[PDB]
Amino acid sequence: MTEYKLVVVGAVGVGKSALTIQLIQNHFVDEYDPTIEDSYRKQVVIDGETCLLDILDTAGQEEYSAMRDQYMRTGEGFLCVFAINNTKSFEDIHHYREQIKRVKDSEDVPMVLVGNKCDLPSRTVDTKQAQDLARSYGIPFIETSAKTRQGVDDAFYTLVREIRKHKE
Ligand SMILES: Nc1nc2c(ncn2[C@@H]2O[C@H](COP(=O)(O)OP(=O)(O)O)[C@@H](O)[C@H]2O)c(=O)[nH]1
Ligand SMILES: [Mg+2]
């Protein structure tokens, strides 16, 4: 069976953990310690293909984790998450993409730009802004809400589709 190794990155508070838990466990977590980094696995069917997802929910801590290092080394695609009501988190995206490029020594890493918390009306990062930054990176942009579970499977599945392209 096919496995896809995914890594979720972005500034604190954007909803990395909430997005991963909605994907895995199908509920919206009210709070999840911002410092906790763990990996999650699930068997899913994407486009009729039964597969295993293996996901790292990063937390940007300093202590050595071999696991973290192994996911950055062998991880096949990356979700780069900002929140649509947090301009600073959008300004921070580029730093994360650049880290990822350096780990892979490649400009061509499967990636999706995720604009989360789209349930919220106070949107300071507009669709066009995000769509334009993604077009500059040559990656997809997907709007999500871990709260309403809007776009959640689309974001992760899209990243799998980007991995399938790279593999060919
Ligand atoms: N309104 C709303 N709140 C969210 C959404 N995603 C996460 N949050 C909340 O924002 C806070 C930070 O989320 P978290 O997943 O801990 O972010 P992380 O630091 O990126 O892991 C939590 O209290 C979440 O419940 C969402 O899509 N909409
Ligand atoms: Mg978290």
Swiss-Prot record:
The modification N6-acetyllysine is found at residue 104. It is found in: Cell membrane; Endomembrane system; Cytoplasm, Cytosol. SUPFAM superfamilies: P-loop containing nucleoside triphosphate hydrolases. A motif (Effector region) lies at residues 32-40. Its EC number is 3.6.5.2. GTP binds at residues 10-18, 29-35, 59-60, 116-119. Changing residue 34 to L: In NS3; characterized by a defective GTPase-activating protein sensitivity and a strongly reduced interaction with effectors. This is GTPase KRas.
